[PDB]
Amino acid sequence: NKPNRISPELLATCGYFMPRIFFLNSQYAPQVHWGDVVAALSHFPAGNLDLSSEEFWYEWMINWSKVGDSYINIANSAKSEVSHVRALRSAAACYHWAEFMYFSDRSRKIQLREYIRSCFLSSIKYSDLLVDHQYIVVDKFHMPFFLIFPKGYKEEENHPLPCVILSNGLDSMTEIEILSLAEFFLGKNMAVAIFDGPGQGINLGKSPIAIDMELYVSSIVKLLEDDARINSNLLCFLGISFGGYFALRVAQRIGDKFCCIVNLSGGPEIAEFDKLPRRLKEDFQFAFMQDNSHMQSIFDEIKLDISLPCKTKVFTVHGELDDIFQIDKVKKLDQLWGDNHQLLCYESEAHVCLNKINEYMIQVSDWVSEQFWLNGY
Amino acid sequence: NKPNRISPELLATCGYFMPRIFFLNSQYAPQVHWGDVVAALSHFPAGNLDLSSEEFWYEWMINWSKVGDSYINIANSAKSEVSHVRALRSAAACYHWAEFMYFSDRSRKIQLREYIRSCFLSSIKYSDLLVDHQYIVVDKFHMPFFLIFPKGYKEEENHPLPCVILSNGLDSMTEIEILSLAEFFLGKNMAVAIFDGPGQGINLGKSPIAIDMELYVSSIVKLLEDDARINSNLLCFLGISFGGYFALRVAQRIGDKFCCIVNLSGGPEIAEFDKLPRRLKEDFQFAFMQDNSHMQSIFDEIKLDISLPCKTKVFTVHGELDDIFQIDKVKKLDQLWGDNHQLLCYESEAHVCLNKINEYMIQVSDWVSEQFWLNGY
Ligand SMILES: O=C(O)/C=C/c1ccccc1
Ligand SMILES: O=C(O)/C=C/c1ccccc1
Ligand code: NA
Ligand code: NA
Ligand code: NA
Ligand code: NA
């Protein structure tokens, strides 16, 4: 017998995704260990290496699901609350990597996201974070919403807190990548607001993603204005990937509600749909609940009028080699938006600059603090 | 330009070490991100792949040192205490992977361990852990010692706490792997005691490692008996790798001082020195401050008399494919020590079973709690 190991061929093929799978070293957000990746991939079938192929992501979903199941079994037999929660967190992370690039069975994908959300909701009662979970009603839409307070938060010991609203992108899960990002703000005694807009979080595959996500963000801003615990004059909006595109829309439409806005590798338009790499065509199709033939028209509608002014301070982090949001379009926006837009461009980074996420989230979190301080915090 | 990535050849070669480098997802202990591994290895020279070769580990030390330096630069310009500490933690992790398998410049290795310890000591004042740091005098030896209390610990709100003493192995660093393990006990409202015996932690390359480490453990037990905050009737000793060998010695010599002992992949004797794989010959030589020709005689001295009774409950986690502490010798000890020794053996795992460390540390931490409960906690 040889020790369980990942094939070199498979590690190479997955290089783009490894920084995403490991993501940020977090306190609360679910995260894989190296051995979870070995459990998922050590017996992955050989000769299955096409990231654009349906067959690759089916086997990926099956193998990551097995690892999630193993952690649920640990959770169910756990002898302590602390062990139970650590196992639920590990399960949630594994089920997310099972589902995030799997689009072929809508019911299975929704089921995996329900497993993740059940892991999160089960874990809240044991958390040392205060989580205020509710639905925000936006016309007929009941929007899952989480307002999370820093460790050791007591309303009577605090002035009203600054708050960062963070948006999902196309294929993130709220309590995985977005809670991971949110910890950089919770760590600075800021409240955070994370949410499942249409086509986001547990709504992915249920409702189409809303291009006008700023409508839903406006409803969060109204809740935060009404909450005595939150200083609504000290708000930030952060989005990642397609959520960064939402950040640019928020900057244009309701920017005056925000001290500052962070765009983690969104852009004002998407590369040609037909030529998108990996599984991105099926990812966009799934989120918009549309077929291949309808998607370029949606991309045409998504494209921003960059002549429309941005109404607050924007910080964009972008990779020169981004193959979804091309750097040329981001640099054009940076030039046109002038002194109100700061661009951190990494020369040899792909989409979301994930080799640099620890360093750039340090810089981003301190930049947000600085903008609150500039607004009299 | 292509995105910064690790060579497939290099990822393959390093497969044994990747689970060790990523280790445990921690709250306090320094830990790398995937992008730190990319920063270290993306420009690693081609055709340098011999894990037994001095030239491999020189380039490894140089490249990881660059990543550590980059995080010190972030720490030094950090705009907040929280950002400063996260950067110091990242630097410490990187400097540890720079040094842990580098033996060719004693002064450089000691310097890197001093950087790590400076990162740790600098971080303590900002920690929400109470760290009581002192020297324990053992004859002429001044032993660095850290007694760490759980998050939110107040003596007046608590009965005297159980305490887990955790030992380094040959090439671990106290505040990296051992603090990572310790968090599983801190998370259960137990105190932990971590320490630099002779040839351990900042003493590696200064004093030879003590075979009779139980002498130093006895001095910790005396301090814990004297500390009103600690229930000295509720003590555990845990060791990892060569520290697990120390755990077996503690079980034999002072086991009656412990409710239970955990052996993470130590054994009662080491495989033949001359045939050790990778850089293990130079690792053992460095820790014992001896040349190649003296080391088999030291291995002969290390070998336990397994007929000497173990005086408490022992839990061993071991890999069938361990190439340092052979499973046959561990199974012989398990049989001879009978009902007082429990063995968790993973069929396809190498030394320390690092593909399983999250799951087995859940099980181990609950087993320790159970042993304290059996002793009336
Ligand atoms: O939600 C998306 O569409 C993408 C999010 C994301 C999050 C982390 C890394 C890369 C992409
Ligand atoms: O200190 C040693 O000799 C080895 C320790 C260790 C720690 C973590 C993983 C593998 C080995
Ligand atoms: Na358990
Ligand atoms: Na308010
Ligand atoms: Na900073
Ligand atoms: Na005591």
Author numbering:
A (entry chain A), B (entry chain A): 5 to 381
What do the authors say?
The crystal structure of AntI in complex with CA reveals that cinnamic acid functions as a competitive inhibitor by inducing specific structural rearrangements in the lyase, resulting in noncovalent, reversible inhibition. In the open state, the Pro281-Arg283 loop (region I) and Tyr20 are exposed to solvent. However, upon CA binding, this segment undergoes a 90° rotation, causing the side chain of Arg282 to flip inward, while Tyr20 rotates by 120°. These structural rearrangements facilitate π-stacking between Arg282 and Tyr20, leading to the formation of two strong salt bridges between Arg282 and Asp327. In the AntI:CA complex, the catalytic triad remains perfectly aligned (region II), with the active site nucleophile Ser245 positioned just 3.4 Å from the styrene moiety of CA. However, the conjugated π-electron system of the aromatic ring stabilizes the double bond, preventing Ser245 from forming a covalent bond with the ligand. The styrene residue of CA engages in cation-π stacking with Arg24 and π-π stacking with Phe27, while its carboxylate group forms hydrogen bonds with the backbone amides of Gly173, Leu174, and Asp175. This structural rearrangement imposes geometric constraints that generate energetically unfavorable φ- and ψ-dihedral angles in the protein backbone within region II, counteracting the otherwise favorable ligand interactions at the active site.
Here we analyzed the endogenous regulation of anthraquinone (AQ) pigments, which give Photorhabdus species their characteristic orange-to-red coloration during exponential growth. , AQs are aromatic polyketides produced by a type II polyketide synthase system (PKS), which is rarely found in Gram-negative bacteria. After partial cyclization, the AntF-bound intermediate is further processed to a heptaketide by the unusual chain length shortening lyase AntI. , Spontaneous oxidation of precursor compounds results in the red pigment AQ-256, which exhibits a tricyclic structure.
